[PDB]
Design a protein around this ligand. Sequence first.
Ligand SMILES: Nc1ccc(C(=O)N[C@H]2CCC(=O)NC2=O)c(C(F)(F)F)c1
Ligand SMILES: Nc1ccc(C(=O)N[C@H]2CCC(=O)NC2=O)c(C(F)(F)F)c1
Ligand SMILES: [Zn+2]
Ligand SMILES: [Zn+2]
Ligand SMILES: [Zn+2]
Lengths: 87, 104, 104
Amino acid sequence: GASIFRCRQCGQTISRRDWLHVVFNPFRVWCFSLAQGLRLIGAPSGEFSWFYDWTIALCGQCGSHLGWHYEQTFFGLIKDRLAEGPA
Amino acid sequence: SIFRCRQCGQTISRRDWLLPMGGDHEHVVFNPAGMIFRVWCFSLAQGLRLIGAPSGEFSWFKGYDWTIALCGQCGSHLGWHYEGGSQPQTFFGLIKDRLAEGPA
Amino acid sequence: SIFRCRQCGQTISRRDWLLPMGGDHEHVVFNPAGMIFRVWCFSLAQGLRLIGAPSGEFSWFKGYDWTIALCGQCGSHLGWHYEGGSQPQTFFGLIKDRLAEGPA
Ligand SMILES: Nc1ccc(C(=O)N[C@H]2CCC(=O)NC2=O)c(C(F)(F)F)c1
Ligand SMILES: Nc1ccc(C(=O)N[C@H]2CCC(=O)NC2=O)c(C(F)(F)F)c1
Ligand SMILES: [Zn+2]
Ligand SMILES: [Zn+2]
Ligand SMILES: [Zn+2]
């Protein structure tokens, strides 16, 4: 019962197990090769990248900030902004 | 400082008994019926009635089997008891918005 | 969106002013008389009238003193003002079911 990852606020499907780092801001971050249901916003930036340039990733449904897209490319999503459950 | 059942006011647990499982006492989870719960983990609880036999199906906590926990007074579903794991062997996952916090 | 007094319609607060105190803006609490309230936390409010002197007895929020907050227009009890803490110094806990949410 922890194989699909959804937005904590609204329950939008974001990523999978399947597609699967503790960091400090200037978070428990989960790295995914693929994701869905996001909206990537703004221009890429390298400022204090934990890894790659980053772009902000919002929930495409409710607009909640769920993490970043890195760009070969991958997603770094904030564990505490996600809800885990079954497929 | 203590948690009561939101429906009837039965004594359930204490803030002192909050337990950080895997870094935090709060876990936001969804069940296979798509219900989302904000679950708080407690080492200890009282005033519940645990129903059925333990099951490991769709357990949100690796290594633990769950049993449904009702309010022993009013029968409202307050969460689950977890067992069969280690460090700790057992704990309770209670639904935050089914509880009411207040003075001892 | 804005929150208005359910009884008379006076403007009280804004969704923009929601404030997560200790993790969430919503707290379900009980007072020493056993009355249960669903409280939403806001950083600011308007149109209220605070009654009495601040008191720290049985505060739901450690480090804050409370005063009762009435609707300044109709006198309906809408919640409490909190003060004397830090980050933030002051905020409001308003009873969600006494408010009506709607467009500005
Ligand atoms: N029909 C249903 C289906 C699933 C569940 C449910 O929550 N299941 C939990 C059990 C505890 C856990 O660790 N993971 C789960 O998925 C419920 C229930 F809410 F009533 F219990 C009713
Ligand atoms: N007899 C009584 C007893 C207590 C209270 C009460 O609300 N107390 C709150 C005040 C706010 C808080 O942070 N904690 C509390 O315990 C009331 C009242 F409803 F009028 F205000 C009448
Ligand atoms: Zn969302
Ligand atoms: Zn009950
Ligand atoms: Zn009013």
